């Protein structure tokens, strides 16, 4: 199991059977901002089970992230992509995103099931309304009093015997350096720096510029989520060599996040400048490449199930409907990305193991 390979999971999946109601499998058509533009394309809720807001068709079908079988199967398919850690997208308690409902009440299942297949969780935190500081403090505190017991919590084991708490910050750029700085340098006004809520706190870069904010803010690392190879500065990887470079002086962990390939035009029918085809796995294996040649201390992936944005490594199957040729991974397997994954988590896992200074 390779524990610096990390793949980012959602867990706000929901159907009638165990939810009472569909949830995110019926998620809407995205309005473009222009309501002249918007009136062109779809709208409206996705009728699931056949019409569901993605291009993919996933195996599990219309699932539900409560589901302890659906759970199960997850954490089967990371264990056997040799994925020693999910990131779990996650809302403090009674707060969700805007599509969605709360899911921190699940997420002590997930842990157990992660247990049974030994895997780990860490925290991916999602931009909920009014972040700041103050509420990241409490959060970070009710994760760790929480979760942190759990042996299936995931901590960054150092050399020297220490453990660390990660979080990924989504978004982290939406708050100002400043604001950060109180929670995240040694003397700022609320620092959890040195107590026993300290943690390895991962900021996303989407400019080139937010590297300086970063700097500022007291981060430890940057990660840079989109699967789009042009889309941002940081999903280029063209910019992983300089990334890499720029975290090394600094001392911060550099974690590229990698993915499959990219379409969300299911609920953001406006955005095909970013969609990216699969190329049958050649896509994935160009972003693994490339993350490999940086050497980083952590690898992220993206993802293993958002289902919207098309970049999911969960397997997926062929669907036709009367209106409908959904995606999927032909001529290859349902199982295709966990063992391309597999593949190149073992090239990472030994390579990673030479990196090392006492070699
Ligand atoms: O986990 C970080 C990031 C990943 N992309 C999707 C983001 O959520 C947003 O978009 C989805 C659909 O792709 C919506 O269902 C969510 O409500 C929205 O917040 C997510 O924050
Ligand atoms: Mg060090």
């Given at each position: 199991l390779n524990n610096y390979?990390?793949?980012?999971?959602?867990?706000?999946?929901?159907?009638?059977?165990?939810?009472?109601?569909y949830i995110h499998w019926n998620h809407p058509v995205l309005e473009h901002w222009d309501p002249?533009?918007?009136?062109?394309?779809?709208?409206?809720?996705?009728?699931?089970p056949d019409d569901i807001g993605s291009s993919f068709?996933?195996?599990?079908?219309?699932?539900?992230?409560?589901?302890?079988?659906?759970?199960?199967?997850?954490?089967?398919?990371?264990?056997?992509?040799?994925?020693?850690?999910?990131?779990?997208?996650?809302?403090?308690?009674?707060?969700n995103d805007e599509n969605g409902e709360p899911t921190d009440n699940l997420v002590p299942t997930i842990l157990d099931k992660a247990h049974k297949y030994n895997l780990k969780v860490t925290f991916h935190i999602e931009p909920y309304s009014n972040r700041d500081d103050q509420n990241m403090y409490k959060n970070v505190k009710y994760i760790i009093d929480k979760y942190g017991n759990h042996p299936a919590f995931y901590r960054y084991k150092t050399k020297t015997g220490n453990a660390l708490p990660m979080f990924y910050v989504y978004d982290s750029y939406i708050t100002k350096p400043e604001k950060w700085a109180n929670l995240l340098?040694?003397?700022?006004?609320?620092?959890?720096?040195?107590?026993?809520?300290?943690?390895?706190?991962?900021?996303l870069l989407v400019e080139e510029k937010h590297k300086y904010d970063i700097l500022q803010?007291?981060?430890?690392?940057?990660?840079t989520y989109f699967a789009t190879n042009g889309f941002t500065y940081g999903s280029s990887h063209?910019?992983?060599?300089?990334?890499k470079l720029f975290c090394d002086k600094y001392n911060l962990?550099?974690?590229?996040?990698?993915?499959?390939?990219?379409?969300?035009?299911?609920?953001?029918?406006?955005?095909?400048?970013?969609?990216?085809?699969r190329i049958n796995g050649k896509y994935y294996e160009i972003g693994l490449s490339a993350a490999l040649?940086?050497?980083?201390?952590?690898?992220?992936?993206t993802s293993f199930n958002e289902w919207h944005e098309g970049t999911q490594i969960e397997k997926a199957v062929p669907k036709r409907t009367s209106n409908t040729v959904y995606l999927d991974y032909r001529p290859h397997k349902p199982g295709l990305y966990l063992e391309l994954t597999r593949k190149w988590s073992e090239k990472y896992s030994k390579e990673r193991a030479t990196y090392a200074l006492d070699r």
């Open positions: 390979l990390h793949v980012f999971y959602y867990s706000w999946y929901g159907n009638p059977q165990f939810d009472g109601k002249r533009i918007a009136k062109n394309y779809p709208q409206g809720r996705h009728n699931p068709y996933p195996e599990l079908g219309s699932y539900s992230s409560r589901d302890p079988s659906v759970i199960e199967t997850h954490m089967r398919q990371m264990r056997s992509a040799s994925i020693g850690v999910l990131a779990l997208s996650w809302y403090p308690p009674d707060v340098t040694t003397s700022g006004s609320r620092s959890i720096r040195n107590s026993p809520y300290d943690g390895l706190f991962i900021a803010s007291g981060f430890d690392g940057i990660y063209q910019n992983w060599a300089s990334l962990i550099f974690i590229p996040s990698v993915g499959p390939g990219y379409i969300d035009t299911s609920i953001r029918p406006w955005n095909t400048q970013n969609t990216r085809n040649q940086t050497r980083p201390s952590l690898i992220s992936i």
